[PDB]
Amino acid sequence: TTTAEVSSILEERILGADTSVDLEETGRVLSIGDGIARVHGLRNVQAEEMVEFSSGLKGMSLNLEPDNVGVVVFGNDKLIKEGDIVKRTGAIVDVPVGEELLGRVVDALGNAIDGKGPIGSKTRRRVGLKAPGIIPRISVREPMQTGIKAVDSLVPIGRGQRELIIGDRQTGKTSIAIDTIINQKRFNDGTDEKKKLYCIYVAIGQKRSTVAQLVKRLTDADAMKYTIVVSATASDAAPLQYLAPYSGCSMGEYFRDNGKHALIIYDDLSKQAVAYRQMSLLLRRPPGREAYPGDVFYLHSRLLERAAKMNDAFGGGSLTALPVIETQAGDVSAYIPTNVISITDGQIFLETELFYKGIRPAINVGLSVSRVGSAAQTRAMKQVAGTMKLELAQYREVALDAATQQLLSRGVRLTELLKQGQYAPMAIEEQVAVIYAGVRGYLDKLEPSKITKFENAFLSHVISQHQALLGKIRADGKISEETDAKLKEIVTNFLAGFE
Amino acid sequence: TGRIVAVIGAVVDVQFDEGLPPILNALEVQGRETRLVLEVAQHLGESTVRTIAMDGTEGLVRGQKVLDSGAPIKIPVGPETLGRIMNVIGEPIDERGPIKTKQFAAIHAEAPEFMEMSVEQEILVTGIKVVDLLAPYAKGGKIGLFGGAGVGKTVLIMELINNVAKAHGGYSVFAGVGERTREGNDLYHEMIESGVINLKDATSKVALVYGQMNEPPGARARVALTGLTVAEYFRDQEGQDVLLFIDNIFRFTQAGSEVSALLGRIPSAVGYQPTLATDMGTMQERITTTKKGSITSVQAIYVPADDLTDPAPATTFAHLDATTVLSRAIAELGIYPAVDPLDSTSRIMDPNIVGSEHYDVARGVQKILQDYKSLQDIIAILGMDELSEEDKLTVSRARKIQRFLSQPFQVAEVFTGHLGKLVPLKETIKGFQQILAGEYDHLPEQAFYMVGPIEEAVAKADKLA
Amino acid sequence: ATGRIVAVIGAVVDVQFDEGLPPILNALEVQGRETRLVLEVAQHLGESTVRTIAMDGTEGLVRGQKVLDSGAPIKIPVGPETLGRIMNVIGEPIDERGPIKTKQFAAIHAEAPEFMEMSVEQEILVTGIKVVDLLAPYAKGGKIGLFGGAGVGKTVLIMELINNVAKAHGGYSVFAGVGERTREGNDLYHEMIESGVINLKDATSKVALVYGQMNEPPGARARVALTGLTVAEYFRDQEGQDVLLFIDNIFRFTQAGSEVSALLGRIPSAVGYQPTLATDMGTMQERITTTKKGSITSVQAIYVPADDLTDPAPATTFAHLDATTVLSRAIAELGIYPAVDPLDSTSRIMDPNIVGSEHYDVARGVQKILQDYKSLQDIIAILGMDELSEEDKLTVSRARKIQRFLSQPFQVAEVFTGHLGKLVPLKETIKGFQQILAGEYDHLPEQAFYMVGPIEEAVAKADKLA
Amino acid sequence: GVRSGAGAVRDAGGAFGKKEQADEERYFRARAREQLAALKKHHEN
Amino acid sequence: ESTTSEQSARMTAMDNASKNASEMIDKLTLTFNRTRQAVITKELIEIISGAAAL
Ligand SMILES: Nc1ncnc2c1ncn2[C@@H]1O[C@H](COP(=O)(O)OP(=O)(O)OP(=O)(O)O)[C@@H](O)[C@H]1O
Ligand SMILES: Nc1ncnc2c1ncn2[C@@H]1O[C@H](COP(=O)(O)OP(=O)(O)O)[C@@H](O)[C@H]1O
Ligand SMILES: [Mg+2]
């Protein structure tokens, strides 16, 4: 038999009462279960069209069978029963978009969950738009300062790039993203209008309490006013977690297509992959490696490929993506991690060994790369970071001769220099000066355990009285010869004073 | 009222005429001596709903009438559920008469909304020095209690219940998922002896929810939700800092996998249900800190094949906020409680949450213990005279610390005759800070064994010689 | 003949025709869409109903929508006018430079060259890379594969091969980007514009581009490789030219087939792959061959899922390659770039009659000493270096020096490491490896051979750290 | 929990198993040579 | 002097060998867990496919 060969539909046909019910635009649920609802009717429904149930839940018409329609429910299937009336909305599944969502904590479908009122959106954008082609894109040029010394120095992230934050549990993957969100405040407050970065954070499957605490952290740092929090937590149904990344991706595409720059944080894309695997298995589709569907790579590719940098012909906007992949026991060579690595333009490994030893952030500078990051790096930061990277690589190579002893000492000093606190992103010029201090051999004399104290004092000293030099560095974008001499003099003076 | 059309295994299909019950609705089978509750899981079509059974399906005849209760499985809840044992369907199984309460609550409830969630991490002071110092329990968090028998896990559970009842004035719920009947009876009588549950007056502090291993997988899949509903009543209608216990979460995952397999759903990796993450989330997200109160869950964990990367332990760790491991080696060393000071970790062990002083003290204690491990290795290999004076003083301080972590328990007073101590967090921090500062280096090693506040340690030192 | 859409499940659309069922592999245009959605017939399900694979997104398709049969397979513009242009799966110019005005069109699906048309001529394609030239030399007009995991160097290696050969190649070149990063395609397009291999002003361009990327639906990604292959076939056959066919990545073709076969209604094969995993791969690959009309020197990048060479998709493709280059993540961890595995990369022209006696002897000696070192690695790992014999220590030192010396900087990788790319000739690397095996450089440090080109650079780097 | 047993070095058939087999064979070849020499000297009597 | 030095060096070398062996043991344990899970998943997928194709 078939789904619509049920006795009730047959009775409706033979009795001739198939005229009163509107089968063209509405439908009745034949069988709700396993998260997929079969609907009889909706003859004029479209593929991927969003349909709303009687209870209030909305669903996406995935399978258009000859006799029925397979609708995935964006919510708990308990509220859906057999015989419920399903009606079309006449639109492919979309999400409210615009600047009215800035500062709003929304769910996968754009509904506000912060209790601050309805979203005042005026335009809706489809969640499954194709990524821009070859022509509309241009190479990544503008930098995207994260505020992390290790990131902005050794693994620079461009504006429009896709950089993966990959690591194990409790390795600071979320902390890097949060600091990046906070770091943009300096650019957003100013009137540059080309360095503003409207951040977006998407929570996929993580705890509701964690998302609430993240929102509290952003509000306390006055960073909520330019960020959008799309929440699809663990309690939310699997379709919501599957759809959540695409909703935030569309929200960022709005900024991308209007000449503005946006940042999207796909936190826990692995949890989205797990949710999609659940959806596929409940649909009885052939599983593959690790019981995953065969199209998980497409699932992540059609999402991350939308993040790109547009040329001046298409407004010159951009959309930077920082997906987060959770790895088990640091297994980089796993299905989902390797799929995401094959998509992103880099990775930031956060080894649990370094995190345990106290190296926070736990970036594995040996294995962390950024393919298109060198072009999108400021000249002064590049000048210091090239030498820093060379010295760190040489330190890693050797880790009793005088030369190798000096190399090991310099490497230890630089490693202690890269250590940074939480929720305190640094300005680009401040990082340039700090790295300049270590690179030019002004820390070889100090004991390694005193380097952090030295930096804490040196930041305060420079940011207070020597503001002119930092402003000159920020305006120029490079460390000039006069700038080099002045910075050398002041760092030597402070080193003498520090004692 | 429907009729049974399929009795395949524990999966029973009921066909209704007038009104199809929604999913997760309780169906009561007629004509049976003992209540048989069926939970609707699917709508198969043709006015037929596929249900899983909460009891044996023998004696079911195609055509038996089943009544739709109109709501999910509703359990008796209230202050009168304390000191009682109830199964998944809420029936009392302690043979002490019906549990007479005022209101019932459905086990299947939505997680608290985003606004209801608290936005500030807060430490739940358990009164235990080792726990409150090195692996503090976040209020509304989840704790993974590692270790099995021979390490006093049940004693620790009873002492946690007693401490939370005495300090925060909050009751506790023990939901045994797949718990052995013999071990269930032993725990019941041990709790009776400890006084955490009283059979005479209404001073009991634990509400027991037992799903035994001989029950169908559907029963063990919802026993955790039953206990969680019992805790939710206290959190919401009374605003207490409830303490939920799940022994253990792995059997909850196994019951979920069995239930999914019975419904003919293609399994995920390592033979787990496709809805493993979603079911675990729906269970755990109700364990949070609302504005009225909070629920803190101390869930025992069994790691299958000793593989922390298996889907069940990984999904469980995804929700954990702290871990307490009871090492048999520590118990053999004579330190009770047997919480391992090194392997136990807490996510809230951060200066921004517990304060700079607490974080510094805990980090110093852990560093001294690790240095003691290294020096003990050296002493095992070389001689004790090889190490310097600094190494000897660090060894002495670390021994004093690891004997100070031991603490008498009120629940064990009747056995060992030693009065139990509820050490406040401030006293614990101050004592360990003073020990690290070398203030009490002249006191003997046994001066800190099985004492509460450091004042009792100096008193015991005075008692010695 | 016009049909009506009956089923829309993913990228698979089922169409029922009142009369005139279109044959298999026939393009069907869907009427009523702003874009051009074209369906490729895959099965005749009976009851005058066909099952099709869509070449674009199926969003907005309504059951009963009118779709018109084109009466022919998917045809693309082909000819000299396709050089210097970007095409999609169905031959639509996506470089917004106007229509591709070619005098003829070619069907996407064609039969592979027959047995008699095959050619057996074998030469050596010196690519200027030490590892490739020494151990697994490439043959002109022979299929080449670049195996590797995720981020091991496949794209960098294929770009280096392009920079080395295609710019100096007299004939035309065809690049087919299948399931790769779109920004990589944009970078390649701009690099070829800057280098002059693609000219936007006059008809002097030498390379034609076809791009179906990872953003495309699985139907598109399963046929873009066929589009690039068809362009290469035209350039090989109807013009008698020597053509380079760079494909990256070719595994996405198999992945797209696996994605669509689940909906097509096939019992899955091992690791959830399609049962027709080897048949379609063979049909696609055997068309990429050197016939007697012309030669297609093809370089194909093959993704290796989960770094598992035993996966069916990277396992069945070994039989279709003359020269195999297997990158490894473990080598890339040691910093040896390129990450070519010297004990897993093989070539068919590695024979003393073809490559020369000296070359074969040097390559075999290098492989032997590397295998001996790898066998000794376990004892070194557990006990220590001091437990080995003196000859064993000498072999370990020489093998580590060889491992360092295999690494070579790339011109395309200059912007990454800051080291100038080096293009060694075949004789120079032969002499260098022969000298290293002989023992002339048993006094230099191991690091003297790292990221250098000719052995003269190694000896001029050794004395720097005197 | 995964555990091991006795005589698992040769079962793996790795470098250490072959090393142990070769060492045993080389030692017992010498021992057999010595025993053969002693037996021949005895048989001469 | 030689026997004292030899015993000290023997102890140090055996300790280093034990540390290296333990490191290899944990790496192989992770690999073994991955392989075991993969085997279980593969066999279950085969069983499910065989049942569904019936
Ligand atoms: N730079 C830092 N310095 C110090 N502590 C840090 C730093 N970054 C993160 N942490 C600590 O790490 C812990 C949690 O880190 P975080 O949530 O960012 O990691 P994660 O791996 O993304 O987590 P999860 O998988 O739980 O979402 C907290 O205790 C926090 O204090
Ligand atoms: N020859 C090389 N020299 C230095 N680094 C390389 C080389 N080849 C690859 N890489 C590293 O690999 C990355 C690019 O890998 P890619 O070629 O994209 O692999 P895949 O195509 O498999 O993703 C770069 O970030 C670079 O650091
Ligand atoms: Mg690539």
TrEMBL record, chain A:
It comes from the Eukaryota. Pfam families: ATP-synt_ab, ATP-synt_ab_C, ATP-synt_ab_N. It is found in: Cell membrane; Mitochondrion inner membrane. Residues 24-90 form the ATPase F1/V1/A1 complex alpha/beta subunit N-terminal domain. Keywords: ATP synthesis, ATP-binding, CF(1), Hydrogen ion transport, Ion transport, Membrane, Metal-binding, Nucleotide-binding, Transport. It is a peripheral membrane protein. HAMAP family: ATP_synth_alpha_bact. PANTHER family: ATP SYNTHASE SUBUNIT ALPHA, MITOCHONDRIAL. This is ATP synthase subunit alpha. It comes from Sus scrofa (Pig). The lineage of its organism: Eukaryota, Metazoa, Chordata, Craniata, Vertebrata. The gene is ATP5F1A.
UniProtKB/TrEMBL annotation, chain C:
Keywords: ATP synthesis, ATP-binding, CF(1), Hydrogen ion transport, Ion transport, Membrane, Metal-binding, Nucleotide-binding, Translocase, Transport. The keyword RNA-binding does not apply. The keyword Translocase applies. GO terms for cellular component: cytoplasm; proton-transporting ATP synthase complex. It is found in: Membrane. ATP binds at residues 348, 351. Mg(2+) 2 binds at residues 155, 180, 184. Residues 140-324 form the AAA+ ATPase domain. Its EC number is 7.1.2.2. Produces ATP from ADP in the presence of a proton gradient across the membrane. Catalytic subunit beta, of the mitochondrial membrane ATP synthase complex (F(1)F(0) ATP synthase or Complex V) that produces ATP from ADP in the presence of a proton gradient across the membrane which is generated by electron transport complexes of the respiratory chain. ATP synthase complex consist of a soluble F(1) head domain - the catalytic core - and a membrane F(1) domain - the membrane proton channel. These two domains are linked by a central stalk rotating inside the F(1) region and a stationary peripheral stalk. Belongs to the ATPase alpha/beta chains family. F-type ATPases have 2 components, CF(1) - the catalytic core - and CF(0) - the membrane proton channel. CF(1) and CF(0) have multiple subunits. This is ATP synthase subunit beta.
Automatic annotation (TrEMBL), chain E:
It is found in: Mitochondrion inner membrane. Signal peptide: none annotated. F-type ATPases have 2 components, CF(1) - the catalytic core - and CF(0) - the membrane proton channel. CF(1) and CF(0) have multiple subunits. Component of the ATP synthase complex composed at least of ATP5F1A/subunit alpha, ATP5F1B/subunit beta, ATP5MC1/subunit c (homooctomer), MT-ATP6/subunit a, MT-ATP8/subunit 8, ATP5ME/subunit e, ATP5MF/subunit f, ATP5MG/subunit g, ATP5MK/subunit k, ATP5MJ/subunit j, ATP5F1C/subunit gamma, ATP5F1D/subunit delta, ATP5F1E/subunit epsilon, ATP5PF/subunit F6, ATP5PB/subunit b, ATP5PD/subunit d, ATP5PO/subunit OSCP. Belongs to the ATPase gamma chain family. Subunit gamma, of the mitochondrial membrane ATP synthase complex (F(1)F(0) ATP synthase or Complex V) that produces ATP from ADP in the presence of a proton gradient across the membrane which is generated by electron transport complexes of the respiratory chain. ATP synthase complex consist of a soluble F(1) head domain - the catalytic core - and a membrane F(1) domain - the membrane proton channel. These two domains are linked by a central stalk rotating inside the F(1) region and a stationary peripheral stalk. This is ATP synthase subunit gamma.
